[PDB]
Design a protein around this nucleic acid. Sequence first.
DNA 1: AGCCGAGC
DNA 2: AGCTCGGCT
DNA 3: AGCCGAGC
DNA 4: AGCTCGGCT
Lengths: 708, 708
Amino acid sequence: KGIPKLDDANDAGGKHSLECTLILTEGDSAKSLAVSGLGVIGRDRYGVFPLRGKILNVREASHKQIMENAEINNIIKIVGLQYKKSYDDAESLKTLRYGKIMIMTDQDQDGSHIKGLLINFIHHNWPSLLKHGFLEEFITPIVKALSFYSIPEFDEWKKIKYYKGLGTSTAKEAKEYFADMERHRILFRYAGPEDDAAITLAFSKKKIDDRKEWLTNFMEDRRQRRLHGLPEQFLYKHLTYNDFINKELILFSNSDNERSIPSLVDGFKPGQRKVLFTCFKRNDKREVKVAQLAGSVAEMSAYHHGEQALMMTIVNLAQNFVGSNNINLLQPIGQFGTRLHGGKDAASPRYIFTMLSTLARLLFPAVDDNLLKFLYDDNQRVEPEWYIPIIPMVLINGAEGIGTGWACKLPNYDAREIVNNVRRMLDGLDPHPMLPNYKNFKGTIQELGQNQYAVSGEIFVVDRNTVEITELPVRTWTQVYKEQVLEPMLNGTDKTPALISDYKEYHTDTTVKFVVKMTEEKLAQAEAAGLHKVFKLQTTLTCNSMVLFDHMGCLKKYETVQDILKEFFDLRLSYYGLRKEWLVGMLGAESTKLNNQARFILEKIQGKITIENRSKKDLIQMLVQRGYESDPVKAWKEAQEGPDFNYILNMSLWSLTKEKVEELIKQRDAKGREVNDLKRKSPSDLWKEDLAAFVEELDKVESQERED
Amino acid sequence: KGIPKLDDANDAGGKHSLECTLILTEGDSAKSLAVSGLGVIGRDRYGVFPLRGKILNVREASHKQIMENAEINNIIKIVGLQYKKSYDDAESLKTLRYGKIMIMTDQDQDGSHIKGLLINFIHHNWPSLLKHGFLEEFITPIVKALSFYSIPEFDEWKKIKYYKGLGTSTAKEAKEYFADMERHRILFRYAGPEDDAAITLAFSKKKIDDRKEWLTNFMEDRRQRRLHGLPEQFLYKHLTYNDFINKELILFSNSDNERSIPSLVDGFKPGQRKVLFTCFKRNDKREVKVAQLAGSVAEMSAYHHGEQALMMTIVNLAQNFVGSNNINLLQPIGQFGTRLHGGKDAASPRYIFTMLSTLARLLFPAVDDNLLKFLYDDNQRVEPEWYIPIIPMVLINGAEGIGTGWACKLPNYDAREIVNNVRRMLDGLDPHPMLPNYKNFKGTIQELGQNQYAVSGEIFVVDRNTVEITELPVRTWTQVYKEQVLEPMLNGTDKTPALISDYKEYHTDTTVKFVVKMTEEKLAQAEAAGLHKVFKLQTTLTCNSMVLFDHMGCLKKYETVQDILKEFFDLRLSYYGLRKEWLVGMLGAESTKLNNQARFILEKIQGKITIENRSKKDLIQMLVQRGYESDPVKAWKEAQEGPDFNYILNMSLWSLTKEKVEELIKQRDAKGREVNDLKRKSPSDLWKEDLAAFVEELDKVESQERED
DNA sequence: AGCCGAGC
DNA sequence: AGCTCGGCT
DNA sequence: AGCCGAGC
DNA sequence: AGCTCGGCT
Ligand SMILES: [Mn+2]
Ligand SMILES: [Mn+2]
Ligand SMILES: [Mn+2]
Ligand SMILES: [Mn+2]
């Protein structure tokens, strides 16, 4: 047939074609799983073809984009479909190579997404097939203990095995699935108007706001459900397209917003936060290859997606070039991308390295980890719902992402202006308004209207024939500008003749210099029309979707950055008071511990009590009879949810030496003074300390950057 | 010109061609290094072309192999050479695009090898060029502190930087090298007959035995030199081909034998031993990807070669299929290759894992590490000159390798027969003779003549038309046998008609079953001529080169395996006596330590001495005045090349509790009894213990293998 | 001519 | 990638 | 139409 | 690889 990745059913194309089934699989490992699953006998009436991934959404797409799509036309040639053909009459179905499509995907949410896009494809092009049951799915278990086809069903029911993707199952497993097909095969049924309404609601861009309402209800409902203790409702026999869209695809849509839409608190997405948690736990003193760090992240954070997406998450986190990260929390040791190509010139993750910026733990103090809520994946504690940085990182690095029904775009903001605004609010004033600010951007950004800005590079008149372009607007890449602006100006086009006579390039990996030559008259005309407009050095920047998850995990639209700043500020200063409470608890327990250590050893050297030959039971009983406390640090740590004095009896015999008692009394007095000194500090003073340290290191680091 | 990897000199092919120089580089990183080194001005008269690696040796090679060699014809087209053309007359040199070839390689030995093969190429095809100085080299530094062009020069001279390959130097470095070319450029000169004699000696297979004598002298000389303290002689101005061959290439030849020819002792090559040392130091409880283990080996063992060669070293170490390793010291967790394709079907090192066999440390006991001599790379201690296994592993896994002037081939041998021979020698008898034995090989191996054997698979007559082939001779691969034996028998050839009517394949990944169908008369004729001959189931195995490095590092040829066995036996039992000496030293120091601990604490509880408030100096002085020994373990460990009693004073206060004194007296008596019990054991009893444990685990492991 | 394997 | 190097079928 | 990025 | 998803030029 000409498609090498396809294994065609023996009876496909023959007089039995209508009884044949094409199995569309997610990935080629699923392909092999199904192939071995059917074996010799299954090969007659069952074809199997792989899909690379998410497919084209054909409902709104251009004609050229559809006609040039390799996968779509592969499925068309395999099944024998013809565009605009309706299938009712026997004469019409004589032309099909297969009578059914059985989609086999993972039992996770992205699988459901592929299911939905295939449903949308068939529903858009051939409703004649969709109404009559041309489409089926082959479900697999996500967990076993007997089999369970969704995590809520297994949780409600409650050796346990978790199945990540179809490739995890193998060998006999696959064959087992294909011996009993009554349980694993589910037919999509068309009930009526509700089905069409549901499909178009999911896959049409006219329905975006509808999707918003859709998802909103879901979120509220589930939270309300979660509040009242009602169990999660789950699927998995016939399944109507409506019930699929609203009870299954919807969880992909919500999971898509949850992974794609950052938190207001730390400005992170679950993947990024997993990466940073892993880095925090490893605490590498030396650089680590991005591929190896990626695998380590996967192990330690329980990151269940593919390695490529995570490696590029890391790369995106490390990028320091103009227009990317105002503060990069990972160091880009390697080629991580440049201003020239916009980062697309980054070297392979196998050949580049990274590690924590020395500002990372200054922005996310280690002690604050004791204030967070760490989540769990199958009894493995992984990473918190959020970190709580000393300043609103969601504003600094310009968080963005694309979900379903909502998207998020924020531009960057100067760290020092944000630090100053936090200081203003700590001193009881109102914050100043803030325009976006991009580190090392030499151009201007000026406020046009509400949430709209003009971003302009720099261009100068050198002389009558010469202009010098020293800056391009933020996110305009050097190579792209050359190809799409200066080169068309120089060579001219069909409609537009040549404006400029020549140009030359003086660039730095981090900077832009163009020297353009024009005729006298044509420069005069260009500056009459204005230089930034003619040379395309002004772009509009409009942020009307700032969508973030607040500290409750609720999606919220913020109209101004000052709202983000205030909400963050309240939360963060609350957590600073929490940090003081925790610190007086911990330091207080430590000081009591040091005090009972000192009393014990001071009485041993003073001769008040002798430990020699005392039985363990008799000694512990005597110690509790003499008033010694039990391990105040372990007791206070356990209290946050036999008597242990080991902290006293595991001390060295060196303890009773004169300089050990001396240094231990000094430690005791010093810890007491530490508790008294921190007790008199306000939480705001704690915050100001953190901010001062952060700016000291920020000046050192950025001046080292400019010197290098 | 059509070669994309080439950067051609601007003046190449023009009227200045004779003044142009083609730079042949080792690898493309060297190519880029030279490109940036010449810059804009250098590009006019200097071309640069990369070589993949070692090139074809054209002196003895087939005509087809030469005419089809891509690199050779690339250099010919680039320079403009013509085979059989002599270059003297001006008319003849009018046809060359370049006047000189400048070879730029690494300053290590393999670079010298490439230099030699280019010299051999030009000398073979065009002596007219070689006599007149057509060839130059561009040397680079191997180390800096000023620059040094060989490690012996730098050692004799003695921030220090070591240069591994040309790719380590970069940027300004390269440009520096090409600003001063008087120091870095060296011209090869043809003195006379000595040069030709030297080149042919190196590169001709008629000269193998000559090379042997050659290398022998060198080895002896250097050892003699090394014995008398005379410094190593080094090179690096003109260099004659003779002086190059005998003073430079020769060190590649010797290094090639040292890496390619295993030791008699542990049966390893430096790379393999580095791998196993790394595994021993990591002590992985879980599997590790072969790529990651490879990188870790590189870091910890100071392995200076490419990652591919090391990853395949690991793969070769893990292979358990019939005809590879009788005992695989690494576990093949993945697809590491099968009997079918001979291991060439192994999966990529990124997708497969390994770890230590549970017999690894039973064959190489950890305590024996204290008896070895660990080498050093730039102050980093890495791995021993050899390990000392409990049985001669060089016989078990069938060590082999190809150097210069010598090669090594040994077949495998049964572990249990070797263990039994060692037991025989420990009981004072002579060893039995041993034929080669391959684990899980169902065929036969029979002695023909001295060091020659017949290896035969298994074939049976089922009935008049049918024969069954259940075994192929060792190292004959299933796929290869099918393609080159059964398929030609079935399809016939131009000369030979078809002997067999059909065949079918019943194979297991680990086993071979062929059922062949023939005519009655033709089976009769085949068994008349014999079934093993007709069906190519007998191969000859001749081992007349068994070449190993003895325990002195001297190359030695062994005529029989019994010589290997005896030499190993003497060395190993010597090291068992050493192990007893070391063990009574260590256990004796431990027992003294426990005794002074017990005396101290027993006198503290008895009240004989009080430590409370005593000054550190006063206490240490009193302790040495009262007879307490100083840290016998640290003193005895230091003796193998202020007073420290910390081992007594860092004890817990729990020490003075009644059950701690009780268990400590029990530990003391138990260690004394341990010293007395091991003192009465012979070294042979130690060896027999090791052998018994090894066979217990060997039976458990191999029975688990057959069950799985 | 091809295979064996540590190297380029 | 296609090759080295020596022994051997 | 294309860009932005975590996913397939 | 070529695609999703929403906002915006
Ligand atoms: Mn999945
Ligand atoms: Mn960004
Ligand atoms: Mn090298
Ligand atoms: Mn082997």
